[PDB]
A paper describes a structure:
Three formyl peptide receptors (FPR1, FPR2, and FPR3), which belong to the GPCR superfamily, participate in many physiological processes in humans. FPR2, also known as the lipoxin A4 receptor (LXA4R, ALX), plays important roles in chemotaxis, cell proliferation, wound healing, migration, and vessel growth, and is involved in the pathogenesis of chronic inflammatory diseases such as rheumatoid arthritis, colitis, Alzheimer’s disease, systemic amyloidosis and atherosclerosis. Trp-Lys-Tyr-Met-Val-D-Met-NH2 (WKYMVm), a highly potent FPR2 agonist isolated through a library screening of synthetic peptides, showed therapeutic effects on cutaneous wound healing, coronary artery stenosis and ischemic neovascularization, and has been considered as a promising drug candidate.
To facilitate crystal packing, the N-terminal residues M1-E2 of FPR2 were replaced with a thermostable apocytochrome b562RIL (bRIL)11 fusion protein and five residues at C terminus were truncated. A single mutation S2115.48L (superscript indicates residue numbering using the Ballesteros Weinstein nomenclature) was introduced to further improve protein quality. The FPR2-WKYMVm complex structure was determined at 2.8 Å resolution. A close inspection of the ligand-binding pocket has found two hydrophobic clusters that play critical roles in ligand recognition and receptor activation.
Numbering used by the authors:
A (entry chain A): 1000 to 1106, 3 to 322
B (entry chain B): 1 to 6
The structure:
């Protein structure tokens, strides 16, 4: 067992002490601490992790790089024991160059998504059908989403009467429609092993439309829950204050919040080109500001902040609202008689179950991937997290075509209004 | 690690 993080923390910390010089034994004290850290860093090599065997063309080369690292440490160490602090610091500059090679080697392999279509570890027929499965789910979500939410845009948007309810369903329909309309670009990207055959402009346009509407979808779901909660708990306040004019103002909130949380996509998402002929639409971590050492710490904190916001703001906030609001509604109906209970109980327990079943797996996988970010960076561990992204993503994406039946067409006025709008159709 | 929506 060994921790590469504390090793490279010791290596970078002592490299700064060597630049301070100020003495001769101070360079020797730092280089000795660097040599101990480089030895442990050689012990933390993933030799057993990737084909455990002696004398290998790819396993004995990552261990040979530390020999050149330890070799350069001795070069600066022999010149330090001779009192010459100038030749010792000059040899430490080459020691920084190889350190920048390992940091870039960690960042490039990290920003490169693992192409599970060519890896031998996922060659079995089981993994082969589990890669087509999220593609099929996105396929049926594309057709059902653009039609299901398209009908709501037409019916509840132009055929029904402008109420607070129809405005809520229209915004929810415009969110899921704009999202599901980008599924063809994401299904061919997932089918090519996370590659991006589209331009740099589409890499930023599509993933912004995705993050804005998906954030909007869950935020509006919680907004509908809040509005439904106030009607049942405060019916007198609703008829005297719940107006269409007020709903026009307070509903821009969820969209502004979805727009701000998408700024990281607008600024740091771009098309990167791997050394061979492969293009990926990801965060270009190996092309940010500061020293290469600084690019390592800002990459973890950025993805940590992104994983926290995805879980807390993107799930804990709407899930708590949905659970509490419909829970307070279930208590208000349990109080008085069954006058308001015109909708079956399967309707009340579906908006809280469909939102949880669809989002919790993906939110759980993305959350585990955030707490194991460093384990994936220094060791490439927890590859099951990457494997489960697409399957759990498609499940959450499928919620964008279930909301029409859960919220809109579950009522009586919407379903019959759609029938009379289409001429000569089956009932 | 892969790019995740959210
Ligand atoms: C960016 C666009 C895409 C869809 C847009 C929303 C669609 C519908 C409405 C109408 C009204 O409710 C207030 C603005 C609001 C909520 C828009 C705000 C700006 C918006 C979020
Ligand atoms: C933090 C996440 C994970 C869970 C949510 C915890 C907090 C915010 C929740 C849990 C139960 C909630 C309460 C449940 C019921 C009521 C009664 C209602 O008339 C006013 C709000 C009030 C008092 C809620 C306030 C918010 C509340 C205290």
């Amino acid at each position: 067992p060994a921790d590469l993080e504390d090793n490279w923390e010791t290596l970078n910390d002592n490299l700064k002490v060597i630049e301070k010089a100020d003495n001769a034994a101070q360079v020797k004290d730092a280089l000795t601490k660097m040599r101990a850290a480089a030895l442990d860093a050689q012990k933390a090599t993933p030799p057993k992790l990737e084909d455990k065997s002696p004398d290998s063309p790819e396993m004995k080369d990552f261990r040979h790089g530390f020999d050149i690292l330890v070799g350069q440490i001795d070069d600066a160490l022999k010149l330090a024991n001779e009192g010459k602090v100038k030749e010792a610091q000059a040899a430490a500059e080459q020691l920084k160059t190889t350190r920048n090679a390992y940091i870039q080697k960690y960042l490039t392999n990290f920003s490169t998504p693992l192409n599970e279509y060519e890896e031998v570890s996922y060659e079995s027929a089981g993994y082969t059908v589990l890669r087509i499965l999220p593609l099929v789910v996105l396929g049926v979500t594309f057709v059902l989403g653009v039609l299901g939410n398209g009908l709501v845009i037409w019916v509840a948007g132009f055929r029904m009467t402008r109420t607070v309810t129809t405005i809520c369903y229209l915004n929810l329909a415009l969110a899921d429609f704009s999202f599901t309309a980008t599924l063809p670009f994401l299904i061919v990207s997932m089918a090519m092993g996370e590659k991006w055959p589209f331009g740099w402009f589409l890499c930023k346009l599509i993933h912004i439309v995705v993050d804005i509407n998906l954030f909007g979808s869950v935020f509006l779901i919680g907004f509908i829950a809040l509005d439904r909660c106030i009607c049942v708990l405060h019916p007198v306040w609703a008829q005297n204050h719940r107006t269409v004019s007020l709903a026009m103002k307070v509903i821009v909130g969820p969209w502004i919040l979805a727009l701000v949380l998408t700024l990281p996509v607008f600024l740091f998402l771009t098309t990167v080109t791997i050394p061979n002929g492969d293009t990926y639409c990801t965060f270009n971590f190996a092309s940010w500001g500061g020293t290469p050492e600084e690019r390592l710490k800002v990459a973890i904190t950025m993805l940590t902040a992104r994983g926290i916001i995805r879980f807390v703001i993107g799930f804990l906030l709407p899930m708590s609202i949905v659970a509490i609001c419909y829970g307070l509604i279930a208590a208000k109906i349990h109080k008085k008689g069954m006058i308001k209970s015109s909708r079956p109980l399967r309707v009340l327990t579906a908006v809280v179950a469909s939102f949880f079943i669809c989002w919790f797996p993906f939110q759980l996988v993305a959350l585990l991937g955030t707490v194991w970010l460093k384990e994936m960076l220094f060791y490439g561990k927890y590859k099951i997290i990457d494997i489960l992204v697409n399957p759990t993503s498609s499940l959450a994406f499928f919620n964008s075509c279930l909301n029409p039946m859960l919220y809109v067409f579950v009522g009586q006025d919407f379903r019959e209004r759609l029938i009379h709008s289409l001429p000569t159709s089956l009932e | 690690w892969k790019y995740m929506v959210x």
